[PDB]
């Protein structure tokens with residue numbers, strides 16, 4: 001009854017500003033092609049109704065579920081069908097089915113214009129109206145990333161306000177702002193991929209997959225906490241992530257604030273690093289908790305072999321509650337090994353399971369399971385080796401060269417994937433060298449497997465919507481935890497039928513000359529993928545010969561008196577020499 005006024009309750013708990021920011025984010029993520037001006041109106045209508053409900057909770061409609069009021073507002077958008085086609089059909093449904101329907105139409109690759117920073121323009125807008133400026137920011141990010149973790153987005157608006165406040169008083173605005181925006185953009189993209197993975201886990205592997213992942217991660221972060229404190233927190237946190245992934249953004253933010261306050265209330269049982277966070281206002285406090293460094297491993301923890309290999313009762317304990325016993329193995333192993341990746345720790349738990357399945361049926365189980373850590377070694381040696389060979393390859397060739405070697409690998413592994421996605425994924429995979437090869441020894445495996453999971457999840461999300469490789473389907477869907485090693489093991493897809501040589505990718509207009517460097521590399525990388533789709537067994541020398549010819553040709557025509565003339569009239573030679581080189 002009273003708290004049937006969910007909207008008043010959210011408005012009271014979050015305050016007007018956050019309430020509006022979250023409602024704006026929600027409309028932007030479901031209706032990614034509506035203009036800001038439209039969404040601002042819908043936000044203001046809901047905020048007014050919220051204020052009415054707050055003054056009187058018995059006003060008509062104040063008892064509806066917030067997520068029902070929100071859906072209803074979606075359904076009352078006049079251009080809903082015009083713009084979102086089928087999406088309109090979702091309106092014929094009852095909740096929760098309606099929402100699930102809408103969520104199905106979130107577009108992970110909306111291919112919205114690139115937002116290129118005009119420092120003076122940004123600053124004029126920021127000076128004119130700070131609130132509108134931040135609103136437009138939330139809307140641009142949220143419509144491009146319809147799974148962006150909403151409370152963090154509110155945070156990135158707040159944190160970066162100082163940016164604009166400082167920068168926009170400077171005479172040289174561009175020199176001040178541009179580095180900061182690049183940094184902002186980097187934070188955003190990583191935050192987006194991370195949340196997109198959490199929402200994919202929950203949807204494709206279920207809530208329990210995200211819980212296991214979080215047990216391992218939180219046991220590393222707060223290794224002094226009790227198992228049951230970690231599971232309480234992971235459960236609350238996974239609820240918050242679920243609510244955010246399902247578009248329940250105000251309940252999401254409200255739950256996260258309670259979680260943040262719970263963690264600060266119990267900081268002494270969790271981690272001494274939390275002291276930093278616990279006197280901050282709520283968005284910042286939450287952000288700081290999500291980013292806290294791993295606490296030190298306490299002293300005097302028994303060796304893992306005591307409960308899990310040496311003990312005579314392993315089988316009985318396992319048999320009485322497998323899930324608890326294995327959750328507990330995962331907690332005990334994670335808290336002791338901050339230098340292992342979460343996904344490696346989950347692999348270790350899975351193999352430990354398979355071992356006791358095998359061992360607990362035998363005549364003498366103890367003799368078999370006592371040596372289990374020897375059997376697990378390989379799951380630690382394989383990632384370290386992956387890092388060692390790829391980092392050496394990265395440092396031998398640098399980022400661009402490492403990207404190209406990954407283009408060659410991935411195009412062979414999944415040559416049916418569209419060329420822009422293979423390029424996009426391969427360039428990100430190459431950047432995992434830039435982000436992780438130089439890290440401390442104990443951060444390298446966590447850094448590498450985490451970024452790999454984010455980027456492979458991105459390939460899985462794109463592929464799930466237009467499946468074209470059965471091997472990608474298998475590695476995306478068979479096991480979240482083994483995704484990375486499943487992709488790692490793929491070899492040249494032997495069922496693939498090469499395409500004819502696609503010349504357009506080796507033919508250009510004069511405006512290639514003025515492309516930003518990044519775009520120029522993407523041009524060469526596109527060409528490289530297309531070489532491999534045509535001749536997947538091309539040799540390193542043939543690939544090198546073709547690309548060198550390519551760059552030499554582009555240089556030559558960009559030097560010409562008549563650039564378009566040289567590209568058009570000489571262009572057939574590059575095409576011919578490229579084909580000659582692949583013989």
Ligand SMILES: C[C@H](CO)OC[C@@H](C)OC[C@H](C)OC[C@@H](C)O
Pocket residue numbers: 016017018020021024040043131132134135154157158161
């Ligand atoms: C209605 C309004 C746009 O006019 O909505 C957006 C607004 C509430 O932005 C919230 C955002 C978190 O505030 C940023 C800080 C720096 O004030």
Ligand SMILES: C[C@H](CO)OC[C@@H](C)OC[C@H](C)OC[C@@H](C)O
Pocket residue numbers: 208209211212215231323324325326327328330346349350481
């Ligand atoms: C599910 C996982 C493979 O993803 O491996 C099994 C194991 C790690 O389960 C952990 C899970 C969080 O159990 C915790 C229960 C006891 O509270």
Ligand SMILES: O=C(O)c1cc(I)cc(I)c1O
Pocket residue numbers: 218237256257259260261263286289290
């Ligand atoms: O994902 C988060 O936002 C997050 C938020 C809180 I509060 C605490 C933890 I640990 C988190 O990891």
Ligand SMILES: O=C(O)c1cc(I)cc(I)c1O
Pocket residue numbers: 194197198201209210213214217449450451453454
């Ligand atoms: O932050 C998480 O909770 C998280 C969850 C999953 I599933 C995968 C990665 I990499 C993560 O960082």
